[PDB]
Amino acid sequence: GLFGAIAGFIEGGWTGMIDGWYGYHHENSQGSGYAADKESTQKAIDGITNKVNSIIDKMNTQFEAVGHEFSNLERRIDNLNKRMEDGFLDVWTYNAELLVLLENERTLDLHDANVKNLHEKVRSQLRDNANDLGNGCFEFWHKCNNECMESVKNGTYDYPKYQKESRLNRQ
């Protein structure tokens, strides 16, 4: 099912992030920008490439009808051949068309899960050192420089390092 992120609590996408499917937008004194998430984007590409290739590969056989002819006294086996040829045509049409419907659903949900997981990955590190706006953004309770931003992306964010500074800001 829907994982609630895409067109969810993150209401829209970024036309400004062009180097990846999932990523970050950061803000501090050193300026701003979009940056793709390097881990999740590549892994998604690998999986979807695999899905597309795997689907193509399982579709890589063909029922081949023939142009054989039948006399006016062969009407029964003629019709037999036709019902068979139409039979497999309808089976493979069903398989192809339904697979596309079902897997398109799965693919879109896959991205949704990837975005949600990416968001929780970040939310989990920042903890109470950041203010969750609920829309996919986090406001820092401390000064967060470019390297600080990088640490979040690496998933290596140092919580106890900034813990006291964040906590002391209580109005």
């Binding site: 970024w14 499917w21 970050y24 056989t61 045509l89 493979w92 079902l102 975005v115 953004c137």
Partner: protein, 324 residues
């Protein structure tokens, strides 16, 4: 200071269908179905197809005199027969097991034309004047180039005539023969004779015998008579004995046959044959694609994508497109 998590969006208006929702715009997708073709015939595996041109398959393989351009050795990747070709079975009659014949030849690669029984094979009979206006070449009457219409000498009777062919080659031989059925007893007596007449063919594996069935029939191509045409395969090492006292349409030229090691095809089409290359050749034309499916034709030779009825099969790769 803040950081946001988000996802890609772009100017893509390309849509896909899902099980829960139709017409869904996505950032990236791939079309799996191919609907495009070149309406023409090309070479498969760098080998040209056989154009039968103005001759039907039967007219060609029987050697209709107007099919002379095709009466030679032939090598094809597949065969193209044109819908309304004028040169068919010119002398009225039925080709027995015609559909099995077309199926066999379709499974073939090459034929080598040679003279099986020369006119000198048959002694005591007239091997010339074996022609008909139903099978014209130019203005003059003629007959098939793979068949010999044998009639009685004016002076003598129609003797029992015999012929023998030992196939010592490694390739099977495709040959043809026939039985003439005159419309009235008069012509039967004039061309062959009275009494019981017979046409007998035999090999190690085949036994064939027929008699004339004299009957008045509606005129076709100015002929109330008929010929029952037959075909068979002389296996390597086998021998054909021909025995007849009359009404024989004799084998003259035959073909050394080469079996195709995969499925061959016979396309019935008006499309032009050209000097070009194709991996996938359908009866409706050439398909050039990396796609998995096609809606063009169920009938093809070579390597083609799976045939379906679908107008489109588009897989989503990217995500739901949601610009700001």
């Amino acid at each position: 200071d803040k950081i946001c998590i988000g996802y890609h969006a772009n100017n893509s208006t390309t849509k896909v269908d899902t099980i829960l929702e139709k017409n869904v715009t996505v950032t990236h997708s791939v079309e799996l179905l191919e609907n495009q073709k070149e309406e023409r015939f090309c070479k498969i595996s760098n080998k040209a197809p056989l154009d039968l041109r103005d001759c039907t398959l039967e007219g060609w393989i029987l050697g209709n005199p107007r099919c002379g351009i095709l009466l030679a050795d032939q090598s094809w990747s597949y065969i193209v027969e044109r819908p309304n070709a004028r040169n068919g079975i010119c002398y009225p009659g039925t080709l027995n097991e015609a559909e099995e014949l077309k199926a066999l030849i379709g499974s073939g690669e090459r034929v080598e034309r040679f003279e099986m029984f020369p006119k000198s094979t048959w002694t005591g009979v007239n091997t010339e004047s074996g022609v008909s206006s139903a099978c014209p070449l130019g203005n003059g009457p003629s007959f098939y180039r793979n068949l010999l219409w044998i009639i009685k000498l004016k002076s003598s009777e129609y003797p029992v005539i015999r012929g023998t062919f030992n196939n010592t080659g490694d390739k099977s031989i495709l040959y043809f023969w026939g039985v003439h059925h005159p419309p009235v007893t008069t012509e039967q007596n004039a061309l062959y004779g009275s009494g019981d007449r017979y046409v007998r063919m035999g090999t190690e594996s085949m036994n064939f015998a027929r008699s004339p069935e004299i009957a008045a029939r509606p005129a076709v191509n100015g002929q109330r008579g008929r010929i029952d045409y037959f075909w068979s395969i002389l296996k390597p090492g086998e021998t054909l004995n021909v025995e007849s006292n009359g009404n024989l349409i004799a084998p003259w030229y035959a073909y050394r046959f080469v079996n195709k090691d995969s499925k061959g095809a016979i396309f019935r089409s008006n499309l032009p044959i050209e000097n070009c290359d194709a991996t996938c050749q359908t009866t409706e034309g050439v398909i050039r694609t990396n796609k998995t499916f096609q809606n063009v034709s169920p009938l093809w030779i070579g390597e083609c994508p799976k045939y379906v009825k679908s107008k489109s099969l588009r897989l989503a790769t990217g995500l739901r497109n949601v610009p700001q």
